[PDB]
Write a protein that binds this ligand. Structure first.
Ligand SMILES: Clc1ccc(-n2cnnn2)cc1
Ligand code: NA
Lengths: 29, 10, 251
């Protein structure tokens, strides 16, 4: 996999979250 | 419905 | 996407649009996996029953987009395909088994805040995250209903138990397909719909905080029907084919 893959510049790179990604996390049980 | 993309792409 | 919300800006920076040159129209979605490789569904390119059989020159890809129809000047990038590779055992005759294809762009697309590849899974990522109940996220500019959205839509949907998938349909499900969606009892809804095909189903790894693409929107019987689920290409089962194609024809 590409070194920097799957980290988004307006979110992961800046340590900001989007409005519903916690819904995904909350499901990884 | 779609706006015209510049002709350089066509 | 049926029952979604508007994407945020740069929320889905791998989201690509498969765009027909003439007439000018959305065909499918797709995903940026490297600076010169886009991943899509084979049926967006080849589906003989509907006299669909595109070549590199029929199509454009549009990366960086949010708005469906507008030309996003200074933001999006539009690319020409240099080659299409359809999975040699894509079954268009039966059930869209191995519904995967790659496109090699003519020149590498430049990354930005709006344009960034997604990761493909490994054996461990798949083992860990492709589990019934675990939610992934689906994005696209397809129909809002079985009308059309101004901006890119998003919906988070749970992976569904394998038995429950097979029993919702008369089509023969294969190991290269999983389904996702709420049950009629779960209360929440949502689905992909027409034009969303090809697009990413992704999951954010809780282990390394990286977005991986686990599925490709592949098919379903209607959009957001109770007791029915959308089916997705199992991206990890077909990845040796991905690497093979990229290792041979890539630069
Ligand atoms: Cl996953 C999925 C793919 C395509 C559809 N559509 C069926 N008809 N239009 N879109 C629904 C779900
Ligand atoms: Na459904």
């Amino acid at each position: 996999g590409e070194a920097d893959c799957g980290l988004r510049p307006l979110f992961e790179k800046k340590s900001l979250e989007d409005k519903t990604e916690r819904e995904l996390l909350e499901s990884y049980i | 419905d779609f706006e015209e993309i510049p002709e350089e792409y066509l | 996407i049926v029952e979604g919300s508007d994407a945020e800006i740069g929320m889905s920076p791998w989201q690509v649009m498969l765009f027909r040159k003439s007439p000018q129209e959305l065909l499918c979605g797709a995903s940026l996996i490297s600076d010169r490789w886009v991943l899509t569904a084979a049926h967006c390119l080849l589906y003989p029953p509907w006299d669909k059989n595109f070549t590199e020159n029929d199509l454009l890809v549009r990366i960086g987009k949010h708005s469906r129809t507008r030309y996003e000047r200074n933001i999006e990038k539009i690319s020409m395909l240099e080659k299409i590779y359809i999975h040699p055992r894509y079954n268009w005759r039966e059930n869209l088994d191995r519904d995967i294809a790659l496109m090699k762009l003519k020149k590498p697309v430049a990354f930005s805040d709006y344009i960034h590849p997604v990761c493909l899974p490994d054996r461990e990522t798949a083992a860990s995250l492709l589990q019934a109940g675990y939610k992934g996220r689906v994005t696209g500019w397809g129909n809002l209903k079985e009308g059309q959205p101004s901006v890119l839509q998003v919906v988070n949907l749970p992976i569904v138990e394998r038995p429950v998938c097979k029993d919702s349909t008369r089509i023969r499900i294969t190991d290269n397909m999983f389904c996702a969606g709420y049950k009629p009892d779960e209360g929440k809804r949502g689905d992909a719909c027409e034009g969303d095909s090809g697009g990413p189903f992704v999951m954010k790894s809780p282990f390394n905080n990286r977005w991986y693409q686990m599925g490709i929107v592949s098919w379903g019987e209607g959009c957001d029907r109770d007791g029915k689920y959308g089916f997705y290409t199992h991206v990890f089962r077909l990845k040796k084919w991905i690497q093979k194609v990229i290792d041979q024809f890539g630069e």
